[PDB]
């Protein structure tokens, strides 16, 4: 069904390639925490290329023409637009299936977030190469919503800690229950058949 992807520590083109391949098959994929998607290269170069992309505009009418989004979710959505056949009613359905969110919505606070190993910064970059933050780029050029998103992110991180302490307490209780007795008759069978 849905594929809730974390966006922290992923590279833009790698994650866009994997999302654009998995969205043409029908798996409804949603990339959350889009402000944390890293981009390799120097951050000055990345904002210089994005400034050149802003400089690209129609001169006879700027409204009828290139629409330059500043929000990082819409940056990733344009990145996947440039890779899907969006002029056809296959890539149009794929863009309808794709959803993207800066920050985290409440149902994606509820559900578990996946992490793609092939798109990671650590996997795809030598650790002495420079990088960038898409949220830093978006706040530096246009997207004026870094502080509100960071405040709500710290709020949901505190919520995640106060849920995780309860979950870890329940896991300590169930391992006390596993430490208790009168369960081993099935457990010998399970150890002999892959506990």
């Amino acid at each position: 069904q849905v594929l809730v992807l974390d966006g922290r520590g992923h590279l833009l083109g790698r994650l866009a390639a994997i999302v654009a391949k998995q969205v043409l098959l029908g798996r409804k994929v949603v990339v959350v925490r889009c402000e944390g998607i890293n981009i390799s290269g120097n951050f000055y170069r990345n904002k210089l290329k994005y400034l050149a992309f802003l400089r690209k505009r129609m001169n006879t009418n700027p409204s009828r023409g290139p629409y330059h989004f500043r929000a990082p979710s819409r940056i990733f959505w344009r990145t996947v637009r440039g890779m899907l056949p969006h002029k056809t009613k296959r890539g149009q359905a794929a863009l309808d299936r794709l959803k993207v969110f800066d920050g985290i919505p409440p149902p994606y606070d509820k559900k578990k977030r996946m992490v793609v190993p092939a798109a990671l910064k650590v996997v795809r970059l030598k650790p002495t190469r420079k990088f960038a933050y898409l949220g830093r780029l978006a706040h530096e050029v246009g997207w004026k919503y870094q502080a509100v998103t960071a405040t709500l992110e710290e709020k949901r991180k505190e919520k995640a800690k106060i849920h995780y302490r309860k979950k870890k307490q329940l896991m300590r209780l169930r391992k006390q229950a596993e430490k208790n007795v009168e369960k081993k008759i099935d457990k010998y069978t399970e150890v002999l058949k892959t506990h």
């Binding site: 043409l24 098959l25 029908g26 296959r90 359905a93 794929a94």
Partner: protein, 109 residues
């Protein structure tokens, strides 16, 4: 009770860069992600379940609104585990990004 068919997403026709060959189709089947893994599915039979508003079904008891274009796996395709398949009639091309059943009969268990 319980599903007996393996899930496989229709991926597209056999094609080049420019032109297509609509007599053979491609299936990204779940679980298979290897050339060595797409050996067990050689000879399985596929089925595209779709809907219509006229009353045409199998004669297994009740008339309903379900139509199926049958077919079967011919051979493997590429290193990623994609599977070629020739059906009895060609695909409607609306089936892109939709699922075709792969049932576990005549293969060699």
């Amino acid at each position: 009770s319980g599903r007996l068919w393996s899930k496989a997403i229709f991926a597209g026709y056999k094609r080049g860069l420019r032109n297509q060959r609509e007599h053979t189709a491609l299936l990204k089947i779940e679980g298979v992600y290897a050339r060595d893994e797409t050996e067990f599915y050689l000879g399985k039979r596929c089925a595209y379940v779709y809907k219509a508003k006229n009353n045409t079904v199998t004669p297994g008891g009740k008339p309903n609104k379900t139509r199926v274009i049958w077919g079967k796996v011919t051979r493997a395709h590429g290193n990623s585990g994609m599977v070629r398949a020739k059906f009895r009639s060609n695909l409607p091309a609306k089936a892109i990004g939709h699922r075709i059943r792969v049932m576990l009969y005549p293969s060699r268990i």
